[model samples]
Target: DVTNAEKLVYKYTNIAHSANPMYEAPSITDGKIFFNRKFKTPSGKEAACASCHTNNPANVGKNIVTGKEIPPLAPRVNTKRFTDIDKVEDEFTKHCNDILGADCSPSEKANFIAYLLTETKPTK
Candidate 1:
């Protein structure tokens, strides 16, 4: 599904210049931490990207607030997930702070992309 996953992962990691000899770039462990780690929202609710996106990235998640049907994030199931870099950047810029109550750093962004890359397949 993610034919160029490593490329996309590096693209963001390089953007953040987050790579250092001290640590592996776009670490999957870091990505999973970012995806599942909860941060408090302004609404006083514990939230993380997965609060809406869910732990199983291959599954459909709800809007939580809007009650809208959000499609699966896996590109294998929802081919449109990361096709547009601009859209991805815009959404991250808009939602990251709103969702986590703080702007996402390059490390955070790279980690998230890496996590998504790992889940780039369909699941039962």
Candidate 2:
């Protein structure tokens, strides 16, 4: 479904469970570690989502490569954040290739969305 964060999380987690029978559901903290941790890129450089998306998923970020303004990742900050499932999967995998130099498992995807939710707190 389009324009729905909840559905997106459900979809990816389902993929995770099916693909990884022994995988445990990730904790919110698990998600946090992912963004903060650095990975080796294809160019042998260190990179991570936090470098561009910032530590807080809800914060605005700029692309390190192109300096393009990236909308916030948290649905709370950017209402249309995870709305398009098309953009959701596509963009994430691209980042994986760029930063991780490897495909992300479904569990990683699930944890990512989970931690992003933590930053989607209501603004006062």
Candidate 3:
């Protein structure tokens, strides 16, 4: 409730820029790439962030491996989504490695957040 979404975006984008001198502020298209890109897993299973979150942030999703239900990812729908910075960073670290097979580059993390922030507005 006390968070500043725009400031968070700028903060993350700055980190991304620092990580790579050529980094660009995440664009809408960059966000889409982050949302939809699939990666390889050791078990021969494929997963993308959207594999669980779905293409629409407003919809509930099921975990592919654990079968747990995931709440809608849109902050508008799931008010708790971004309220905790520690939890956010933890989940990003865990999930990026689990799904993408490596730590997310700062650019990837920023663009992923940028994509989700866009969906935090009105949706059905």
Candidate with best TM-score = 3
State the displacement of the C-alpha of residue 88, model 3, in Å, after optimal TM-score superposition: 1.8
User: What digit string (tens of lDDT, one per residue) describes model 1 on residues 1-124?
Assistant: 3544445667777766644444447777888887888876667778777778788787888888898878987666677777776677778778766765567877777777777777755556
| Model 3 agreement with the true structure over 12-96: per-residue lDDT tens digits | 7899898788886888678778787776678877677789888877678888879999998766567777777767777878877
Choose the strongest candidate by lDDT.
Answer: 2
**Could you tell me which 10 consecutive residues in candidate 2 have the lowest summed lDDT?**
1-10
Candidate 2 per-residue lDDT over residues 60-119, each given as its tens digit: 888899999888888877888766677868887886766666777788888877777778
RMSD, each candidate, Å? 2.5, 2.9, 2.4
Instruction: Kindly report which residue pairs in candidate 2 clash with one another.
Output: none
Residue 115 displacement (Å), model 2 = 0.8
The candidates, ranked best first by lDDT, are 2, 3, 1
Sort by TM-score, top down from the best:
3, 2, 1
Measured with C-alpha atoms, the lDDT of residue 111 in candidate 2 is 84
Model 2: per-residue Cα lDDT at residue 85: 75
Deviating ranges (above 4 Å) for candidate 1? 1-6, 18-24, 121-123
TM-score of each: 0.80, 0.81, 0.82
Q: Rate the local accuracy (lDDT) of all candidates.
A: 0.72, 0.76, 0.73
**lDDT of model 1 at residue 40?**
69
